[PDB]
Amino acid sequence: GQDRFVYTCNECKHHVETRWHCTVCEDYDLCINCYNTKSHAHKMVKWGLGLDD
Amino acid sequence: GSMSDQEAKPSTEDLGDKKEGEYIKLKVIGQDSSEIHFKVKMTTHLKKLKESYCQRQGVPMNSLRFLFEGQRIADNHTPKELGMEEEDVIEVYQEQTGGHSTV
Ligand SMILES: [Zn+2]
Ligand SMILES: [Zn+2]
């Protein structure tokens, strides 16, 4: 499913209008910055629960 | 436990050991005759790249231009588009040398 981005990133502590949660590594959360820089693929599932707009 | 189920890897195909992840290959080639080959870290606005090249040579704010793909982009953003993996190529145009030549 697809929803808002109400979440945070534990790699830089700077959530950004987006959040990808890697399963294989579990309890692992990445933002648009760390994800682009680190290059951590792993079938991530976008998790959100806020208002999109 | 073994490197490969078959037996062993040729190692020939894989030469050297580089991350080739954090860093990317960004270069420029103006019409005049410029050839630069180097890698820059991808964690800051592309500005921290052309700024060194531009300052050490010339500023785009006149003749020199940086075309990321098929348009013009600002140097105050990073997540706007960039998102390069490794092979990052930027085209530039030089109307004038800015020196030596009268025009
Ligand atoms: Zn982050
Ligand atoms: Zn992972």
Write a three-state SS string for chain B: CCCCCCCCCCCCCCCCCCCCCCEEEEEECCCCCCCCCEEEECCCCCHHHHHHHHHHHCCCCCCCCCECCCCECCCCCCCCCCCCCCEEEEECCCCCCCCCCCC
Tally of CA atoms within 13 A in the half-sphere of B57 that contains its CB: 20
Q: Is B55 left (phi over 0), alpha (psi -120 to 50) or beta?
A: alpha
Quote the CA–CA distance of B86 and B37 in Å, as a whole number: 12
Optimal mutation site among B18, B24, B41, B43, interface A, most CBs of chain A within 10 A: B43
The residues in A 1-53 lying below 8 A from B, measured between CB atoms, are 16, 32-33, 36-39
Q: Give Cα separations from B80 to A39, B47, B56 (angstroms).
A: 17, 13, 26
Elucidated via? NMR
Q: Do A37 and B43 touch (CB under 8 A)?
A: yes
Residues of A in contact with B21 (CB under 8 A): 38-39
- Cα B60 to ligand 1 centroid, rounded to whole Å: 32
Domains of chain A in start order, with CATH, are: 1-53 (3.30.60.90)
The tally of domains found in chain B comes to 1
| CA–CA separation, B54 and A38 (whole Å) | 28
- A42, A24 in Cβ contact below 8 A? yes
Q: Which domain holds residue B4?
A: 1-103
